[PDB]
Design a protein around this ligand. Sequence first.
Ligand SMILES: NC(=O)[C@H]1CCCN(C(=O)Cc2ccnc(Cl)c2Br)C1
Ligand SMILES: [Zn+2]
Length: 139
Amino acid sequence: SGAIYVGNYRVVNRHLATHNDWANLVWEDSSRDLLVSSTTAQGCDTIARCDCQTGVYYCSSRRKHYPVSFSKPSLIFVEASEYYPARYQSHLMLAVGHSEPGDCGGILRCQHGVVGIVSTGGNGLVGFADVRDLLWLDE
Ligand SMILES: NC(=O)[C@H]1CCCN(C(=O)Cc2ccnc(Cl)c2Br)C1
Ligand SMILES: [Zn+2]
């Protein structure tokens, strides 16, 4: 589980979005596995605006933060699940590391701020949905 709270926005994985997220929907993209909903309370997480290829992500299934090198966001094939058919997920960044289904929504950060959130996993590779191109989040 896990979300980013920046201004009056809540950024979550779309396959994990709640009834309230959909009743307060702002933007959603099935190919990115992202949904942004509106909040009443203000948030103050900082989104990173950079092209860093190193960072640290929280892995709940180990209660640990791991430093990883990850790929630039791109079109990556994803196996069929109970949420999506077989497809290409865009804006996915991959790193070699541990993840379990429950680790989805864990945040990946660099010295500037939030890079993105855990969205895909398995085979010793953890995938992160990038959020740095979504400039509208900061206003
Ligand atoms: N973005 C998707 O299509 C995911 C929907 C849920 C299923 N999915 C996975 O990759 C499952 C998974 C396995 C091991 N570690 C992690 Cl962090 C995950 Br998430 C694919
Ligand atoms: Zn950075």
